[PDB]
Amino acid sequence: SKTINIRNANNFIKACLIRLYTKRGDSVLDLGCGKGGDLLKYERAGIGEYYGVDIAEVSINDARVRARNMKRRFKVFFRAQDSYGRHMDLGKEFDVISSQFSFHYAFSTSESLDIAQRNIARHLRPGGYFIMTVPSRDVILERYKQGRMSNDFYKIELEKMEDVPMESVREYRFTLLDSVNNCIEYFVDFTRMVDGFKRLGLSLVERKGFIDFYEDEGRRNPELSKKMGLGCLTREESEVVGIYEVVVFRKL
Ligand SMILES: Nc1ncnc2c1ncn2[C@@H]1O[C@H](CSCC[C@H](N)C(=O)O)[C@@H](O)[C@H]1O
């Protein structure tokens, strides 16, 4: 593929995040786990338990095969359901709750976000972290004002002007080479997210852009760099990576 560097970067960034907030023996709840793309990362992190939840059953089964056919020291649990707009009660709490490239889907409606934020807080141990990587609304609107909304790797389209300005847009179309196709993405209303979480005991402890986060980490972990094979992305690839940001809330 022609997006390998972009996959390496994203996985790199995610691995570093996991390394930063997880510790040995931790219990992790992976929301929007997908096809278990982080099982290996967690295996290196030496975590003890892994629970993955995804709305799509086609991905869960893929995450099962992977878990089933891999050298892992942690117990896995998969469940296919809606963890954002449908009540969720798994029974136990977790030290770390991860939602990689998937939490923005919780912003479907006002109620959805609320349910989703409630589902996160009730499955998080006090002191526990909720790490995520979501698209940056600020970034996107700027590329919009610059007219540069795409390239050979991706494409984004906002909604129509009928009685609406930029700040009034709630969603957009995202297309990615060898990935989603005109997938409907919901903008992450940051302020509403913060307030909503703060109301449930979760505080904002980290918000950084993918590129900076990437550059900063790539310098502190040169080994994980060459290990995951990476270094110096083309500006064309940077645009795709630059769309996402890192956000972390902790249950004080
Ligand atoms: N309400 C919901 N509950 C759980 N997963 C959801 C969801 N809405 C969307 N998703 C999931 O969001 C995921 C986004 S992509 C998942 C990628 C994965 N975290 C990685 O790092 O590769 C998809 O697998 C999709 O099925």
Any descriptors?
m7G, rna, binds S-adenosyl-L-homocysteine, Rossmann fold, transferase, monomeric, alpha/beta, 7-stranded mixed β-sheet, 252 residues, cap
Strand content: 25-35%
Please tell me the CATH architecture by its name.
3-Layer(aba) Sandwich
The percent range for helix content is 25-40%
Question: What is the tally of beta strands?
Answer: 10
Q: Which geometry do the CA atoms define?
A: globular
Strand order of the largest sheet: 3-2-1-4-5-10-9
Domains counted in the coordinates: how many? 1
CATH fold title: Rossmann fold
What is the H level of CATH, i.e. the homologous superfamily?
Vaccinia Virus protein VP39
From the alpha carbons, calculate the radius of gyration and give it in angstroms. Answer: 18 Å
Note the run of SSEs as H and E.
HEHEHEEHEHEEEHEHHHE
* Major β-sheet profile: 7 strands, mixed
- Distinct helical segment count: 9
Task: Specify the CATH class.
Answer: Alpha Beta
Bound molecules: S-adenosyl-L-homocysteine
Distance between the termini: 43 Å
Class per helix and strand makeup = alpha/beta
Catalytic activity: a 5'-end (5'-triphosphoguanosine)-ribonucleoside in mRNA + S-adenosyl-L-methionine = a 5'-end (N(7)-methyl 5'-triphosphoguanosine)-ribonucleoside in mRNA + S-adenosyl-L-homocysteine
EC number: 2.1.1.56
Function: mRNA-capping methyltransferase that methylates the N7 position of the added guanosine to the 5'-cap structure of mRNAs. Binds RNA containing 5'-terminal GpppC.
InterPro entries: mRNA_G-N7_MeTrfase_dom, mRNA_G-N7_MeTrfase_euk, RG7MT1, SAM-dependent_MTases_sf
